[PDB]
DNA sequence: CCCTGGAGAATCCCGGTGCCGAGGCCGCTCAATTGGTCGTAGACAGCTCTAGCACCGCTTAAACGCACGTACGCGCTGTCCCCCGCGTTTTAACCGCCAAGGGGATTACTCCCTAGTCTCCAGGCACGTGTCAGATATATACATCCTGTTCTAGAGCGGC
DNA sequence: CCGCTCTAGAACAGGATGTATATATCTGACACGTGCCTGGAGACTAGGGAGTAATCCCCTTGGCGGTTAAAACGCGGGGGACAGCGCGTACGTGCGTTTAAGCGGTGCTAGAGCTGTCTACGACCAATTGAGCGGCCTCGGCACCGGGATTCTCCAGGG
């Protein structure tokens, strides 16, 4: 469930990273937070 | 049966272009390909309709379509 | 990190090699089949089509479109292009005599 | 004193109009006759052709080449050109399947 | 009979393209048009040769030329 | 640089000749027309039964849509060399005329082999089935393409 | 004028994802075997259409001069194909999401073979006969020859 849950810097992890291939998924259980999707992926990665 | 000309989907037309060696496919080619396919089908099927009507049959066989394509110089092997 | 991000044309060539060596039909059976029925409805209301009857029409239409696309593609390089255009098909049918 | 000096293209279009509404044979008779005999002598020697036999060959060859030139010209505007090329003819024969 | 492929002169090829509505004619068109005409003549006359050989005749008639053109989808009227 | 008036030349409308191909006429003869007569393909009636039509689960690969950017269609420039318009001089094209002799066309005699049956039998077709090459499946493995990092060459700058 | 540092093109190596293969096993038509059985073959009869011979007249090839239309050569030049550059958009790539294609299943009947049946229909045979075509007479429509002209087009002058 949800749309953003990851232990590292999230990239819209669903339950899987959207916009990425299926051969990258990790299903480990750690301390997961949202932080408004790491404050909008670190303000668009410091604006490109 | 309406709007069945859209049954030839965009990837289906794209796959036909890839079989023909086409590298880049324009966005306006799908309407033109559908129109060409509709015109080609409106000749062969109508030819098969006259073949079916003349044969005292109400179902179109592949055998009648074989002569319908053959009479236009497009003979098909394997039926 | 970034994905592979294939350049425009690379996957197109892979699709070209795959479909030029495989004989599977590109057009789906049912959407093409219903197109036969609605076209034949203008000529006969009470008409039926065999499974092999729709089969023969599909391969002939696919081969004709592939042959048309081959002539359409060859006109593109002839016209200093790599993208097929609707005017290229209109040139292809007229040269072949199919208007 | 200034010469008329017609620009290229206008007289060519004039020749197009004067030769599309006319029906005279453009290719001369004996040059086409001698070409037929040379080609036929490679297949069978001591072969003769009737006068009307070459007449059928001459009109059919001109109409086939005119129709080929029509597709050759149509390829030029399709390729954003007004001058026909030898590659234009090769494309025309390939599309026709010849 | 040699060098008879040059009998189709450059203005004659120029005149043929004028009938087809060709604006400008390249210098390499005449050599290609002669080759295309030679290939086309090599098929029609050879077919007419077999027609003449089948009739036990030594002179090719106009009717055999018509049948040679008719079998390739280029039927001719008037002969 | 664009708009407009005047004149050079290929093209179009028109009067007179005529001539040679098109229109009209005479036989008449051979192919179209009339009647009869059967073998026989075909329209019609009943059975059926095998394949197509219609609807239903489902699941899953196929397809619509949106975000992004880089190969590419397209707009614009010059040039120069490739092609057209025209003057000149050959050149073979066409018609004018004449035979030639292989050769197309026609007629006839005759002779082989193909039309048409009888019988049969041995190769071909429908049915049944063991089976052996292809497809699905998946970890393994290619395999080339895209991209990142480093190597080396080139131009710019500063000092002696 | 030479050495030093900056910058960038390009060869090279590593990661990535869609296919090339090495089995495991299913599997499903493939070809072999069988039993017929239905069409081709040996043999025969008869006749008819072409092979061959002859004729004939006809028509294409070779072979000349004449001439004037046109191919060919060359000069001037002029407008266009293409190399090149710049813009941008619109189509390649990629997954989210949806949605219908297809596999399998069930039921029904639309109707194509299949078998009789009976029936008009067309090839073939006498008998015939009337306008199509080869040929001849006539005649007029447009090719030819000029004559003239509107009439569309390019070059030069003006704003």
XYZ file of C-alpha atoms (C1' of nucleotides) in Angstrom:
722
model
C 0.000 0.000 0.000
C 0.849 3.682 -0.136
C 2.969 5.507 -2.684
C 6.245 6.374 -0.899
C 7.978 4.134 1.654
C 11.737 3.544 1.719
C 14.602 3.432 4.202
C 16.911 5.425 1.910
C 15.936 8.468 -0.150
C 12.558 7.471 -1.565
C 11.761 7.467 -5.284
C 7.993 6.850 -5.065
C 8.205 3.298 -3.742
C 4.809 1.608 -4.154
C 4.200 -1.273 -1.707
C 8.437 -0.751 -6.533
C 9.953 2.421 -7.993
C 7.628 3.908 -10.597
C 9.306 4.906 -13.837
C 11.963 2.203 -13.399
C 12.413 -1.388 -14.516
C 11.245 -4.399 -12.523
C 14.821 -5.670 -12.035
C 15.648 -3.177 -9.284
C 13.124 -3.979 -6.533
C 14.114 -4.618 -2.923
C 11.556 -5.889 -0.405
C 13.506 -5.561 2.845
C 11.961 -4.280 6.058
C 13.686 -1.276 7.630
C 12.823 2.123 9.114
C 10.782 3.817 6.377
C 9.657 7.457 6.348
C 7.935 9.786 3.887
C 9.097 13.380 4.618
C 6.857 14.591 1.758
C 8.790 12.274 -0.594
C 12.198 13.484 0.685
C 10.995 17.100 0.275
C 10.146 16.595 -3.417
C 13.189 14.402 -4.260
C 15.577 16.978 -2.732
C 13.947 19.904 -4.616
C 14.295 18.192 -8.029
C 17.878 17.071 -7.256
C 19.022 20.650 -6.562
C 17.198 21.724 -9.755
C 18.920 19.355 -12.195
C -20.744 -2.839 -35.769
C -19.292 0.679 -35.765
C -15.851 2.236 -35.220
C -14.166 -1.059 -36.115
C -11.550 0.705 -38.258
C -9.837 1.567 -34.949
C -9.330 -2.151 -34.285
C -6.065 -1.858 -36.209
C -4.280 -0.367 -33.218
C -1.263 1.940 -33.204
C 1.312 -0.732 -32.164
C -0.219 -3.116 -34.719
C 0.481 -0.595 -37.487
C 3.903 0.017 -35.916
C 4.640 -3.723 -36.010
C 3.677 -3.818 -39.699
C 6.127 -0.986 -40.384
C 8.882 -2.800 -38.465
C 8.384 -5.910 -40.612
C 8.792 -3.682 -43.679
C 12.064 -2.218 -42.413
C 10.628 1.173 -41.440
C 12.825 2.880 -38.844
C 10.673 5.895 -37.903
C 6.864 5.922 -37.918
C 4.967 9.201 -38.213
C 1.895 10.012 -36.146
C -0.209 10.711 -39.245
C 0.603 7.366 -40.892
C -1.959 5.431 -38.833
C -4.984 7.147 -40.386
C -3.495 6.721 -43.869
C -2.653 3.044 -43.287
C -6.180 2.420 -41.979
C -7.578 4.127 -45.075
C -5.371 2.060 -47.388
C -6.305 -1.121 -45.507
C -10.000 -0.198 -45.680
C -9.784 0.375 -49.447
C -7.874 -2.886 -49.972
C -10.360 -4.807 -47.817
C -13.337 -3.175 -49.557
C -12.138 -4.689 -52.851
C -11.131 -8.227 -51.838
C -14.069 -8.861 -49.486
C -16.545 -7.450 -52.018
C -14.946 -9.704 -54.640
C -15.344 -12.625 -52.227
C -18.959 -11.553 -51.626
C -19.723 -11.951 -55.337
C -17.857 -15.272 -55.270
C -19.944 -16.373 -52.276
C -23.206 -15.130 -53.809
C -22.515 -16.936 -57.091
C -21.674 -20.196 -55.284
C -25.204 -20.401 -53.771
C -23.654 -20.035 -50.311
C -24.306 -17.609 -47.465
C -20.960 -18.102 -45.677
C -17.667 -16.855 -47.113
C -15.011 -19.554 -47.431
C -11.255 -19.054 -47.595
C -11.375 -20.795 -50.980
C -13.460 -17.953 -52.433
C -11.057 -15.371 -50.980
C -8.210 -17.226 -52.718
C -9.692 -16.536 -56.153
C -10.692 -13.013 -55.086
C -7.031 -12.229 -54.407
C -5.826 -14.240 -57.420
C -7.966 -12.344 -59.953
C -6.210 -9.104 -58.905
C -2.742 -10.655 -59.234
C -2.291 -11.239 -55.490
C -2.516 -15.035 -55.289
C -2.104 -16.442 -51.775
C -0.380 -19.727 -50.939
C -1.430 -21.790 -47.934
C -5.085 -20.646 -48.155
C 21.146 6.864 -11.246
C 19.720 6.678 -14.753
C 18.095 3.966 -16.878
C 19.606 2.583 -20.064
C 17.727 5.169 -22.190
C 18.157 3.650 -25.659
C 18.643 6.215 -28.409
C 15.716 6.769 -30.825
C 16.039 4.074 -33.472
C 17.929 1.430 -31.504
C 14.815 -0.393 -30.278
C 13.295 0.197 -33.725
C 16.093 -1.830 -35.334
C 15.607 -4.620 -32.780
C 11.907 -4.716 -33.671
C 12.893 -4.745 -37.357
C 15.161 -7.773 -36.896
C 12.628 -9.582 -34.696
C 9.605 -9.200 -36.987
C 11.570 -9.907 -40.188
C 12.552 -13.374 -38.904
C 9.380 -14.319 -36.979
C 6.201 -15.310 -38.822
C 3.710 -14.497 -36.061
C 0.843 -12.258 -37.151
C 1.193 -8.666 -35.968
C -2.493 -7.720 -36.236
C -4.715 -9.253 -33.564
C -7.258 -11.801 -34.773
C -10.478 -10.427 -33.259
C -10.173 -6.667 -34.079
C -9.295 -7.572 -37.667
C -12.117 -10.139 -37.801
C -14.784 -7.614 -36.788
C -13.446 -5.240 -39.453
C -14.230 -7.891 -42.083
C -17.804 -8.211 -40.807
C -18.575 -4.481 -40.815
C -17.081 -4.098 -44.304
C -19.064 -7.084 -45.597
C -22.213 -5.741 -43.903
C -22.377 -3.061 -46.612
C -22.591 -5.805 -49.267
C -24.616 -8.520 -47.498
C -26.490 -8.320 -44.199
C -26.844 -12.097 -43.684
C -23.257 -13.206 -44.265
C -20.890 -15.480 -42.352
C -17.120 -15.939 -42.388
C -15.151 -19.090 -41.639
C -12.215 -19.077 -39.238
C -9.918 -19.942 -42.145
C -11.728 -17.350 -44.284
C -10.739 -14.547 -41.902
C -7.314 -16.203 -41.654
C -6.661 -15.913 -45.401
C -7.742 -12.259 -45.482
C -5.435 -11.360 -42.587
C -2.215 -12.731 -44.109
C -2.904 -11.123 -47.496
C -3.636 -7.775 -45.833
C -0.531 -8.060 -43.640
C 1.733 -8.943 -46.578
C 0.246 -6.161 -48.718
C 0.774 -3.627 -45.922
C 4.325 -4.894 -45.346
C 5.044 -4.617 -49.079
C 3.448 -1.158 -49.084
C 5.569 -0.164 -46.076
C 8.684 -1.417 -47.887
C 7.914 0.866 -50.834
C 6.926 3.663 -48.441
C 10.211 3.330 -46.538
C 12.290 3.262 -49.729
C 10.679 6.524 -50.844
C 11.791 8.131 -47.566
C 15.510 7.544 -48.182
C 14.800 8.579 -51.775
C 13.425 11.847 -50.329
C 16.355 12.291 -47.880
C 14.240 11.117 -44.935
C 14.038 8.250 -42.458
C 10.423 8.865 -41.352
C 7.583 7.530 -43.497
C 5.007 10.114 -44.573
C 1.390 9.910 -45.793
C 2.483 11.457 -49.099
C 4.954 8.576 -49.481
C 2.102 6.044 -49.362
C 0.099 8.142 -51.837
C 3.154 8.088 -54.100
C 3.499 4.330 -53.540
C -0.092 3.485 -54.514
C -0.021 5.785 -57.555
C 3.239 4.319 -58.893
C 1.838 0.823 -58.296
C -1.377 1.976 -60.002
C -3.595 1.561 -56.921
C -4.457 5.307 -56.760
C 20.237 44.773 -79.296
C 19.286 42.190 -76.699
C 18.622 38.486 -77.310
C 15.354 37.018 -76.062
C 17.171 34.562 -73.741
C 14.330 32.431 -72.418
C 14.947 31.239 -68.877
C 15.120 27.447 -68.400
C 11.825 25.774 -67.570
C 9.330 27.850 -69.546
C 10.092 26.313 -72.948
C 10.271 22.900 -71.258
C 6.726 23.440 -69.977
C 5.825 24.660 -73.468
C 7.253 21.418 -74.864
C 5.209 19.552 -72.236
C 1.973 21.197 -73.396
C 2.718 20.799 -77.111
C 3.551 17.102 -76.696
C 0.776 16.093 -74.277
C -2.037 17.217 -76.602
C -0.310 15.711 -79.665
C -0.196 12.060 -80.706
C 2.768 11.858 -83.098
C 5.478 9.297 -82.360
C 8.449 10.911 -80.618
C 10.999 8.142 -81.249
C 12.142 7.893 -84.864
C 11.231 4.825 -86.884
C 14.492 3.301 -88.136
C 16.520 3.971 -84.918
C 13.845 2.043 -83.024
C 13.673 -0.501 -85.859
C 17.431 -1.133 -85.802
C 17.438 -1.481 -82.007
C 14.777 -4.209 -82.198
C 16.742 -6.227 -84.770
C 19.970 -6.016 -82.749
C 18.180 -7.181 -79.591
C 16.336 -9.951 -81.450
C 19.513 -11.184 -83.168
C 20.909 -12.125 -79.745
C 17.944 -14.472 -79.211
C 17.547 -15.816 -82.765
C 19.372 -14.956 -85.980
C 17.779 -14.459 -89.420
C 14.660 -12.996 -87.797
C 12.344 -10.512 -89.512
C 9.759 -8.086 -88.142
C 6.698 -6.740 -89.919
C 6.234 -2.999 -90.352
C 3.106 -3.050 -88.181
C 4.883 -5.393 -85.748
C 7.444 -2.696 -84.931
C 4.560 -0.201 -84.847
C 3.040 -2.158 -81.958
C 6.441 -2.307 -80.244
C 7.146 1.413 -80.671
C 3.890 2.752 -79.208
C 3.951 0.290 -76.297
C 7.558 1.162 -75.428
C 6.862 4.908 -75.559
C 3.754 4.638 -73.370
C 5.581 2.440 -70.853
C 8.469 4.918 -70.708
C 6.100 7.906 -70.512
C 4.229 6.240 -67.640
C 7.597 5.443 -66.055
C 8.621 9.082 -66.546
C 5.348 10.176 -64.925
C 6.213 8.127 -61.837
C 9.816 9.334 -62.139
C 8.634 12.955 -62.207
C 6.166 12.305 -59.371
C 9.093 11.051 -57.292
C 10.944 14.339 -57.876
C 8.272 16.604 -56.356
C 7.829 13.994 -53.615
C 11.573 14.425 -52.961
C 11.244 18.255 -53.136
C 12.865 18.432 -56.576
C 12.030 19.344 -60.162
C 14.940 17.515 -61.854
C 14.635 13.761 -62.362
C 17.548 11.506 -61.393
C 18.685 8.001 -62.412
C 17.947 6.937 -58.827
C 14.385 8.211 -59.330
C 13.894 5.647 -62.111
C 15.399 2.883 -59.953
C 12.890 3.669 -57.201
C 10.071 3.698 -59.771
C 10.945 0.244 -61.129
C 11.385 -1.188 -57.623
C 7.960 0.014 -56.443
C 6.335 -1.322 -59.626
C 8.172 -4.619 -59.074
C 10.097 -4.536 -62.362
C 24.384 -4.512 -85.983
C 26.354 -2.844 -83.187
C 25.956 0.298 -81.058
C 22.223 0.403 -81.800
C 21.372 1.269 -78.182
C 22.345 4.859 -79.073
C 19.538 5.015 -81.646
C 17.276 6.348 -78.894
C 18.800 9.820 -78.996
C 19.001 12.254 -76.085
C 16.340 14.648 -77.512
C 14.161 11.581 -78.157
C 14.476 10.676 -74.474
C 13.967 14.388 -73.768
C 10.777 14.365 -75.854
C 9.517 11.224 -74.093
C 9.904 12.902 -70.696
C 8.125 16.013 -72.007
C 5.089 13.841 -72.754
C 5.257 12.646 -69.139
C 5.309 16.186 -67.765
C 8.942 16.167 -66.609
C 10.246 19.643 -65.782
C 14.011 19.055 -65.986
C 15.993 16.052 -67.226
C 19.417 15.146 -65.857
C 22.304 14.112 -68.078
C 22.468 10.651 -66.493
C 18.773 9.977 -67.187
C 19.378 9.218 -70.878
C 21.833 6.403 -70.122
C 19.455 4.946 -67.524
C 16.401 5.308 -69.782
C 18.249 3.508 -72.585
C 19.073 0.669 -70.196
C 15.484 0.454 -68.945
C 14.177 0.449 -72.523
C 16.752 -2.202 -73.459
C 15.627 -4.404 -70.554
C 11.951 -3.877 -71.430
C 12.617 -4.623 -75.106
C 14.656 -7.708 -74.172
C 11.578 -9.159 -72.438
C 8.848 -8.298 -74.958
C 10.829 -9.320 -78.055
C 12.041 -12.549 -76.425
C 8.439 -13.396 -75.520
C 7.451 -12.553 -79.101
C 10.304 -14.780 -80.317
C 8.799 -17.773 -78.494
C 5.389 -16.846 -79.919
C 6.891 -16.748 -83.421
C 8.840 -19.975 -82.838
C 5.677 -21.744 -81.653
C 3.856 -20.883 -84.900
C 6.662 -22.294 -87.117
C 7.133 -18.769 -88.486
C 10.329 -16.853 -89.207
C 8.887 -13.304 -89.109
C 7.426 -11.843 -85.917
C 3.893 -10.562 -86.489
C 2.070 -7.738 -84.724
C -0.401 -10.177 -83.153
C 2.418 -12.029 -81.377
C 3.702 -8.707 -80.013
C 0.209 -8.021 -78.637
C 0.116 -11.407 -76.886
C 3.625 -10.801 -75.530
C 2.468 -7.485 -74.055
C -0.872 -8.895 -72.860
C 0.620 -11.691 -70.735
C 2.585 -9.173 -68.619
C -0.382 -6.911 -67.856
C 0.492 -4.345 -70.549
C -2.129 -5.092 -73.202
C -2.059 -2.874 -76.294
C -5.033 -1.772 -78.400
C -4.946 -0.964 -82.112
C -2.923 -3.888 -83.512
C 13.221 46.003 -54.963
C 8.294 45.682 -56.897
C 4.567 47.499 -60.224
C 3.372 48.467 -64.948
C 3.739 49.629 -70.242
C 5.424 47.938 -74.844
C 7.048 44.638 -78.058
C 9.472 39.712 -79.744
C 8.012 35.116 -80.695
C 5.480 30.653 -80.146
C 0.662 29.683 -80.291
C -4.298 30.135 -81.679
C -8.354 31.415 -84.950
C -9.440 31.472 -89.895
C -9.854 31.256 -95.544
C -8.715 28.080 -99.536
C -7.011 23.172 -101.703
C -7.879 18.592 -101.957
C -7.120 13.923 -101.238
C -7.017 9.996 -99.396
C -9.113 7.665 -95.930
C -13.991 7.361 -94.363
C -18.971 6.731 -95.699
C -22.230 4.411 -98.732
C -23.686 0.531 -102.139
C -23.711 -4.596 -104.498
C -23.317 -9.416 -104.007
C -23.508 -13.211 -101.811
C -21.796 -16.702 -99.187
C -20.707 -18.615 -95.064
C -21.835 -18.155 -90.546
C -26.173 -16.841 -88.157
C -30.972 -18.620 -87.861
C -35.312 -22.556 -87.282
C -36.947 -27.027 -85.800
C -36.344 -31.564 -83.543
C -34.021 -34.982 -80.289
C -32.160 -36.797 -76.746
C -28.182 -37.493 -72.594
C -27.528 -34.970 -69.052
C -26.237 -30.949 -65.894
C -28.991 -28.583 -62.902
C -32.933 -26.859 -59.744
C -35.571 -28.742 -56.181
C -36.807 -31.528 -51.781
C -35.360 -33.967 -47.334
C -31.219 -35.388 -43.654
C -27.810 -34.321 -41.371
C -23.958 -32.967 -38.763
C -19.875 -30.385 -38.489
C -18.324 -25.987 -38.020
C -19.573 -20.765 -36.909
C -22.166 -17.578 -34.011
C -23.273 -15.734 -29.255
C -22.125 -15.393 -24.300
C -19.241 -16.412 -20.305
C -14.653 -16.598 -16.730
C -9.996 -14.926 -16.515
C -5.650 -13.658 -17.084
C -2.267 -11.350 -19.249
C 0.159 -9.766 -22.870
C -1.340 -6.028 -25.909
C -2.646 -1.134 -26.063
C -3.863 4.255 -24.536
C -1.630 7.931 -22.298
C 1.658 11.056 -20.214
C 6.724 12.918 -19.176
C 11.097 13.842 -21.437
C 14.642 14.938 -24.841
C 17.492 14.223 -28.945
C 17.504 12.279 -34.039
C 15.388 14.405 -37.538
C 11.677 17.087 -40.919
C 11.714 21.415 -42.217
C 12.949 26.630 -43.074
C 16.813 29.417 -45.025
C 21.592 30.515 -47.711
C 24.948 30.136 -51.597
C 27.221 28.130 -55.147
C 28.705 26.233 -58.819
C 28.454 23.231 -61.657
C 24.897 20.884 -64.081
C 21.409 21.503 -67.202
C 18.444 24.475 -70.648
C 17.879 28.018 -74.736
C 19.786 29.116 -78.824
C 23.240 29.641 -83.276
C 25.586 26.333 -86.755
C 26.565 22.499 -89.269
C 26.242 17.855 -90.253
C 23.365 13.575 -90.264
C 20.907 10.245 -90.835
C 15.028 10.120 -91.246
C 11.285 9.819 -94.489
C 9.387 9.637 -98.035
C 9.994 8.503 -103.591
C 10.814 4.368 -106.311
C 12.407 -0.854 -107.507
C 13.026 -5.420 -107.264
C 13.870 -9.930 -104.290
C 12.985 -13.929 -102.392
C 12.256 -15.875 -98.004
C 7.876 -16.477 -96.145
C 2.797 -15.841 -94.472
C -1.405 -17.593 -96.103
C -4.355 -21.154 -98.402
C -5.646 -26.050 -100.194
C -5.257 -30.850 -100.241
C -3.627 -36.150 -98.945
C -2.763 -38.634 -95.752
C -1.370 -40.676 -91.560
C -0.820 -40.905 -86.178
C -2.772 -40.239 -82.087
C -5.973 -38.398 -79.556
C -11.590 -38.681 -78.638
C -14.292 -42.559 -76.521
C -15.120 -47.434 -73.951
C -14.174 -52.279 -71.033
C -11.941 -54.109 -67.543
C -8.931 -54.147 -63.765
C -5.397 -53.315 -60.476
C -1.844 -51.146 -58.276
C -0.808 -46.617 -56.687
C -3.318 -43.020 -53.993
C -6.414 -41.614 -50.204
C -8.921 -41.989 -45.417
C -8.092 -43.831 -41.060
C -5.157 -45.172 -36.880
C -1.255 -44.637 -34.273
C 4.055 -44.780 -32.265
C 6.824 -41.414 -32.461
C 10.619 -37.616 -32.922
C 11.537 -32.715 -33.818
C 9.703 -28.215 -32.128
C 8.078 -25.150 -28.203
C 7.616 -23.913 -23.584
C 10.833 -22.744 -19.307
C 14.671 -21.050 -16.900
C 19.318 -20.302 -15.172
C 23.250 -19.293 -18.030
C 25.213 -16.771 -21.282
C 25.995 -13.822 -25.235
C 26.030 -9.489 -27.290
C 26.071 -5.122 -28.853
C 24.721 -0.529 -27.441
C 24.994 3.313 -24.248
C 27.616 5.749 -21.222
C 31.410 7.158 -18.006
C 36.220 7.929 -17.322
C 40.805 8.642 -18.964
C 44.380 9.458 -22.647
C 46.390 12.525 -25.769
C 46.356 16.227 -29.172
C 45.322 21.062 -30.098
C 44.780 26.042 -29.251
C 45.369 29.947 -26.007
C 48.117 32.534 -22.709
C 52.131 34.113 -20.221
C 57.053 34.648 -19.363
C 61.733 35.206 -20.918
C 59.455 32.296 -29.339
C 58.838 28.290 -26.229
C 56.687 26.039 -22.283
C 52.586 25.421 -19.390
C 47.903 24.613 -18.338
C 42.943 24.341 -20.101
C 39.804 22.024 -22.940
C 37.792 18.736 -25.694
C 37.603 14.685 -29.283
C 37.931 9.993 -29.186
C 39.387 5.195 -28.123
C 38.272 1.934 -24.474
C 36.134 -0.632 -20.678
C 32.090 -1.649 -17.805
C 26.949 -2.029 -16.959
C 22.344 -3.258 -19.006
C 18.578 -5.731 -21.120
C 16.861 -8.375 -24.974
C 17.616 -11.891 -26.984
C 21.208 -16.792 -28.495
C 21.517 -21.675 -26.652
C 21.754 -26.058 -23.097
C 19.154 -29.037 -21.500
C 13.835 -31.324 -19.379
C 9.904 -32.374 -20.700
C 5.501 -32.063 -23.097
C 3.231 -32.716 -27.260
C 1.100 -32.878 -31.341
C 1.130 -33.225 -35.844
C 4.491 -36.628 -39.093
C 5.029 -40.247 -41.460
C 4.553 -45.216 -41.499
C 1.232 -49.154 -41.819
C -3.275 -50.901 -43.372
C -7.365 -51.443 -45.912
C -9.492 -50.477 -49.421
C -11.138 -48.617 -53.739
C -11.603 -45.488 -57.426
C -9.059 -43.385 -61.220
C -5.255 -44.372 -64.530
C -3.392 -47.918 -67.731
C -3.363 -51.936 -71.263
C -6.017 -52.884 -75.036
C -9.189 -51.782 -78.637
C -12.153 -48.967 -82.157
C -12.449 -45.120 -85.298
C -11.630 -40.555 -87.315
C -9.891 -36.123 -87.712
C -6.677 -32.438 -87.341
C -1.989 -31.285 -88.395
C 2.765 -32.716 -91.098
C 4.045 -32.336 -95.231
C 4.011 -30.967 -100.076
C 2.784 -27.559 -103.369
C 1.502 -22.890 -104.886
C 1.200 -17.955 -104.894
C 1.377 -13.508 -104.211
C 2.829 -10.444 -101.051
C 5.548 -7.966 -98.060
C 9.705 -6.957 -95.641
C 14.791 -6.110 -96.557
C 18.241 -4.100 -99.062
C 19.349 -0.175 -101.740
C 19.725 3.678 -103.546
C 19.640 9.838 -104.073
C 16.969 14.477 -101.857
C 15.860 17.329 -98.560
C 14.912 19.650 -94.999
C 13.912 18.481 -89.742
C 16.567 17.492 -86.206
C 20.622 15.423 -83.408
C 25.068 17.192 -81.858
C 28.564 20.642 -80.458
C 29.402 24.672 -78.054
C 28.594 29.273 -75.671
C 26.079 31.889 -72.332
C 24.019 31.793 -68.309
C 20.695 30.746 -64.813
C 18.073 28.822 -61.525
C 18.227 24.510 -58.521
C 20.551 20.077 -55.660
C 22.806 19.806 -52.234
C 26.203 20.785 -48.297
C 25.583 23.228 -44.393
C 23.324 25.495 -40.376
C 19.508 26.596 -37.089
C 14.899 25.828 -34.860
C 11.529 22.985 -32.748
C 8.415 19.750 -32.287
C 6.964 15.516 -32.479
C 7.781 11.254 -32.502
C 11.366 7.493 -30.058
C 11.617 5.424 -25.243
C 9.636 4.075 -20.999
C 6.346 2.297 -17.742
C 1.319 3.164 -15.110
C -2.942 1.693 -16.039
C -6.502 -0.146 -18.323
C -8.917 -3.085 -21.418
C -9.866 -6.363 -24.540
C -7.449 -10.748 -27.107
C -7.316 -15.098 -26.647
C -7.810 -19.804 -24.477
C -11.164 -22.888 -22.940
C -16.063 -24.076 -22.368
C -21.112 -24.680 -23.565
C -25.282 -24.416 -26.431
C -27.825 -23.647 -31.104
C -28.749 -23.408 -35.114
C -27.182 -21.274 -40.127
C -26.437 -23.904 -43.579
C -23.028 -26.955 -47.006
C -22.441 -31.579 -48.426
C -24.981 -35.666 -49.526
C -28.595 -38.404 -51.895
C -32.620 -38.917 -54.865
C -35.732 -36.948 -58.412
C -37.495 -35.069 -62.228
C -36.992 -31.661 -65.750
C -35.901 -28.304 -68.988
C -31.475 -27.322 -71.818
C -27.893 -27.156 -75.069
C -24.649 -29.965 -78.525
C -25.662 -32.091 -82.630
C -28.121 -33.122 -86.762
C -30.990 -31.585 -91.493
C -32.374 -27.381 -93.643
C -31.926 -23.168 -94.696
C -31.106 -17.864 -95.615
C -29.845 -13.135 -95.061
C -26.676 -9.125 -93.926
C -21.130 -9.004 -92.832
C -17.195 -8.043 -95.449
C -14.110 -7.833 -99.735
C -14.330 -4.703 -103.075
C -15.785 -0.585 -105.690
C -17.824 4.248 -106.100
C -18.172 8.606 -104.010
C -17.244 12.519 -101.033
C -15.951 15.565 -97.425
C -12.917 16.592 -92.723
C -9.264 17.911 -91.447
C -3.819 17.886 -92.850
C -1.428 21.397 -95.283
C -0.420 26.123 -96.539
C -0.391 30.245 -95.527
C -2.709 34.922 -93.373
C -3.787 37.220 -89.747
C -4.378 38.032 -84.810
C -5.312 38.374 -80.230
C -2.694 37.407 -76.417
C 0.136 36.046 -73.012
C 5.097 36.902 -71.683
C 9.533 39.093 -70.897
C 12.453 43.295 -70.709
C 12.918 48.022 -69.542
C 11.449 52.204 -67.061
C 9.433 54.475 -62.949
C 8.276 55.016 -57.871
